[PDB]
Design a protein around this ligand. Structure first.
Ligand code: FMN
Ligand code: FMN
Ligand code: ORO
Ligand code: ORO
Lengths: 311, 309
């Protein structure tokens, strides 16, 4: 009688889980692995108009409670991911998201013009990255830029799309960002959050930073970011009730996923933990979330989505 | 041969450890325990012109990786901490910092005026809280410039600033550019809690603290990489000032990393709340241990010497 199904965006998802953009989604072999997994969906690596090798290595490092990265958007180029969406993805398995991360509003609109007919025919769904912190400061920490990008994309792209947001840390920013997003009818989902930007890890033995780019500063993922991610999910759930919220950050167990959904998440994305465990993690996360709901008597996610209680 | 001593602000500190403002420093008894502890120094609860009861409880919550709090600046009032600094603190034990967190520039100035006689006579050192997130001036640069100007005109002594965490180099540069205009700012404390996190309990399906719909500042293991980044960012950009590190310290190795990033003093919040003042005995031993394994004899030998990667 229990169900993890999600019915949103004109699609049915078997469960709310998917990878986070950037993790296990850059090559055809990785995307096929995601498609073969039990995840409810998948999303491509954020892509640019041209292929990128990304930053010098080491550019990822495992931390005691998570991860730090300055990948620098290594990706096979937009044409590769468009071809994947248009020709290779098995949509009978699960819906597909494509993440784009052009370096200007014009670069993104040019990609969207070419994505539009493929999205129309095949059903791939756009997620626009406004929060890459490792290349070009983050568009979503500049509200005038943010508004410019959304205007340019909406003019260039006929379909609804979503946005990948950086974490904010005060209600003035939650309100300011929500005010802009609610003014764009095509923004139909908000993904909270990208990594916490520009953390720093130093090794005791070497006395040296652990990644090479940008003097060691890089984005934090994993358990470090979970309370921030929940806060952002719930702040935008409250302020943007006309849009869906996707939760991303710190998900290692079905209990973590349960809390994202209680904060308001429709879909739940998995980044650092998926890098560590591989795509069988989705078998564990569905079983664990179903165990949480069984002990509480819940039969469907809408029985508790967004229903976090106050004291 | 080895020493944890830190010579700054014209004082010799026995070691770099101290409580973080707000932890174990609100009552006469807590201040005494901190003075009796082996800490190199101590700092008072951020105080306000009048007494404050603070937010409705529960307003602190222990987490497995740290803490979330929405205290609400509960404090005995500035007069109490000034009287403590004036008469009751044994300065022969260790130096004393006083934290002030007035709700405007004029409130902070008038407090500083009343504090300046006591600073001069007794040597208490001011830390100006620009980053309280539970009732942040340092997230608005125009306001932070105006606070520092008002303080510098009203206060004839050096002081320091407690900074919120920043998350990109544009904000690091802008904050440093402002701080570097004010020579009376002789130290910068990085960081205050990461603001407006949210924790929910699986069993109750409810937020775990009562104020502000459950949103509050994060401390402890969550914040350590952000704390190190902020310490090092301001160490690089403010070479003419001292950096105090605060954030995620549970062990001597944690303190060692803060010093490599640039910290002169190392403040302890969440771990001290959990462990009590005996933590400073463990922390000095552990840091001396790391130094001994590496042949270091003084903190000046590796403060800020993090290598590239
Ligand atoms: C190695 C790595 C690469 C990433 N690449 C992207 C990316 O291309 N686009 C994006 O929107 N986020 C990217 N992210 C951020 C993740 O999507 C996610 O927002 C963040 O890691 C928090 O989730 P987590 O705690 O499960 O790791 C990347 C994260 C990592 C660790
Ligand atoms: C219960 C509690 C009360 C605090 N009160 C203050 C305060 O009054 N003034 C201040 O500048 N910081 C205050 N802080 C922030 C701490 O000084 C410190 O910046 C933060 O907890 C991060 O350090 P940690 O990871 O070791 O806890 C408080 C933190 C906690 C947990
Ligand atoms: O490619 C990357 O460096 C990257 C992009 C992004 O959006 N987020 C992240 O953490 N890393
Ligand atoms: O009193 C508080 O709520 C408080 C103040 C402050 O500056 N930082 C913090 O975490 N809590």
């Amino acid at each position: 009688s229990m169900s993890l199904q999600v019915g949103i965006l004109g699609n049915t998802f078997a469960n709310p889980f998917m990878n986070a953009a950037g993790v296990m989604c850059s090559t055809e072999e990785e995307l096929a692995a995601m498609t073969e997994s039990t995840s409810g969906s998948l999303i491509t690596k954020s892509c640019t108009p041209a292929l990128r090798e990304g930053n010098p290595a080491p550019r990822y490092y495992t931390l005691p409670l998570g991860s730090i990265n300055s990948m620098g958007l290594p990706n096979k180029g937009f044409d590769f991911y468009l071809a994947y969406s248009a020709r290779h993805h098995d949509y009978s398995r699960k819906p597909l998201f494509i993440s784009i991360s052009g370096f200007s509003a014009e670069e993104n609109a040019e990609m969207c013009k070419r994505l539009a007919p493929v999205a129309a025919e095949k059903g791939v769904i756009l997620e626009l990255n406004l929060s890459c912190p490792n290349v070009k400061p983050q568009v979503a920490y500049d509200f005038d830029a943010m508004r410019r990008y959304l205007a340019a994309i909406s003019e260039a792209y006929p379909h609804p799309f979503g946005v990948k947001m950086p974490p904010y840390f005060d209600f003035a920013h939650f309100d300011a960002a929500a005010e802009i997003l609610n003014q764009f009818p095509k923004v139909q989902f908000i993904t909270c959050i990208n990594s916490i930007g520009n953390g720093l890890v130093i090794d005791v033995e070497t006395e040296s930073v652990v990644i090479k780019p940008k003097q060691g500063f890089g984005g934090l993922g994993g358990r470090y970011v979970f309370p921030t991610a929940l806060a952002n999910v719930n702040a935008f759930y409250r302020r943007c009730p006309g849009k869906l919220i996707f939760g991303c950050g710190g998900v290692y167990t079905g209990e973590d996923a349960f809390l994202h959904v209680l904060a308001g998440a429709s879909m739940v994305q998995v980044g650092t933990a998926l890098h560590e465990e591989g795509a069988a993690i989705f078998e564990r996360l569905t079983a664990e979330l179903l165990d949480v709901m069984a002990k509480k008597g819940y039969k469907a996610l809408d029985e508790f989505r967004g229903k976090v209680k106050a004291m």
